[PDB]
Design a protein around this nucleic acid. Sequence first.
RNA 1: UCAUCU
Length: 90
Amino acid sequence: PVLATKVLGTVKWFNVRNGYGFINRNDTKEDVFVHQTAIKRNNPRKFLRSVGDGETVEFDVVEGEKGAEATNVTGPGGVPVKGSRYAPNR
RNA sequence: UCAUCU
């Protein structure tokens, strides 16, 4: 079950070293947790799993253990995310 | 799951 699909949001922050971040939903203005494994289309020219602070992402919302979370996270229209400056380019 | 990392 998916609570919401293709939600658009702005990354609040994402910690590359520790592997998680938060996205602010553009529709409800609620922060949602995003795990590194929830990123579906990583920047193919970085080599870590990440989204970058402030970038615009598109995602599904599902029920987590500590609140609703983001999953299937991509750029708008399913394109690769930009990724974090804390994740070096190849 | 509110982290603090080039």
